[PDB]
Amino acid sequence: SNQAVKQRIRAIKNIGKITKAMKMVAASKMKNAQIAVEQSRGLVDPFVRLFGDFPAVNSNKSVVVAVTSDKGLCGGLNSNITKYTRATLATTESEGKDVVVVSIGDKGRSQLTRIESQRYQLAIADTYKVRVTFGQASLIVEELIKHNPQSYQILFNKFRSAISFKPTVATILSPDLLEKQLEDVTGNSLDAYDIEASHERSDVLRDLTEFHLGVTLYNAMLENNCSEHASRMSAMENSTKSAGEMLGKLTLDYNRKRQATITTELIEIIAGASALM
C-alpha cells in the first residue's frame, strides 16, 4: 500500500526517462531524414506539370494507397489518413468503379480493414527498417501495375515543417487508356510535345507513368517517414511531460503517506506506553 505507491513512483520515473530517450532518437532520425525529403521532392514536380494533377477522374478501376508508419507510437498520424482514405473512397465512388486498397506500413493494414475490408488486397510493411530507396519503391510500384487500373491514389503526410503535416492525395493516371484522355482538351494537350523516344507516344507514356508512379511513391514514403519521426518527437514530448506531472503528483502523495505512517506508528507506541505507565 505505502509500497504500492513506492513501486508506482519508480515505474513512472523510468517511463519519463524512456520516453525522453525515444524522443531524442526520433529527433536525430528526423534531422537526417529531412535531408532526404527535399532531395526527393525535386523529381516529383516535372511529372505534375507534364501530366497535370487530376484527382477526381472517372476511372473504372483504381488502386488507392494509404502509406502509414510501421510502429504505432507516432500519435495520430496513421489514423489521420485513414480518415482521409475513406474521405476519398467516398468521393470517387459515384460511378460504381473498382477499387483495390493497398497500405504501406503495419499501422495501415491494422486500420484499413477496420473501415474497408473487402477491397483491401495488398499490405506492404517493414519498409522503413533500414532506409527507403528508389529500388524499393520501384518494386512496390510494380505490383501496382500487376493490377491494371485507370488511376492510382497515393495518400501520405507531407512534411511541411516539424509541426504541420498536411495529408496529400497524389494521383497517377495510367497511360494510354486514361492519361491522354484527360489531356484531350481542344485536340490534345500532349500533341505539343515532340516525342523523341524509340517507339510510339502511347508506349513512351507507359514508361513514363510507371516512372511517375515510382517517384511519387518514393517521395510519399519518404515524406511520411519523417512526418512520423516528427510526430514521434512530439508524441514523446507529451509523454515525458505527462509522466513528469504524474510523478510529481505521486511523490507528493507518497510524502503524505510517509508522514502519516510515522505519526500512526508513533501514536500506537505512545498509546501502548501510556497504557502501562
Binding site: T19, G76, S79, Q111, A235, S239, M246
Partner: protein
C-alpha cells in the same frame, strides 16, 4: 475527483452499491443497463493511466469506442437539481425511472 470534473451529483458509480441492484428486485433490463454502464465505466477506469501518458491516439478502436461511450455516460449521469437552481441558474430535472433506463 468527480466533482472537480463538474459532474454533479458527484456520485462515484463504481463505489455506490445497493441491495436493490438485484435482477429479482428491480427487473431484468434495469439490472442489465446498470451493470452494462458500470462495465463501460470500469473499462475506461482501467484505461486512465495509458491515456494519461500515451494519449488518446494509441488505443485500439475497440478501446476508443468505449472511451467515447464512457465519456458520454459520465456526463449523462450528471443532472441539474431543483435545489441548485439558486446558485447555478439551470432548472432542475426530475427524471423518471423509465426515462433513465431507456436513456442509458
Amino acid at each position: 475527483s468527480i466533482a472537480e470534473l463538474g459532474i454533479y451529483p458527484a456520485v462515484d458509480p463504481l463505489d455506490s452499491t445497493s441491495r436493490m441492484l438485484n435482477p429479482n428486485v428491480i427487473g431484468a433490463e434495469h439490472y442489465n443497463v446498470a451493470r452494462g454502464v458500470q462495465k463501460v465505466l470500469q473499462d475506461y477506469k482501467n484505461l486512465q493511466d495509458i491515456i494519461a501518458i500515451l494519449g488518446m491516439d494509441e488505443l485500439s478502436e475497440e478501446d476508443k469506442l468505449t472511451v467515447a461511450r464512457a465519456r458520454k455516460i459520465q456526463r449523462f449521469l450528471s443532472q441539474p437539481f431543483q435545489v441548485a437552481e439558486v446558485f447555478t441558474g439551470t432548472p432542475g430535472k426530475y427524471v423518471d425511472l423509465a426515462d433513465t433506463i431507456s436513456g442509458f
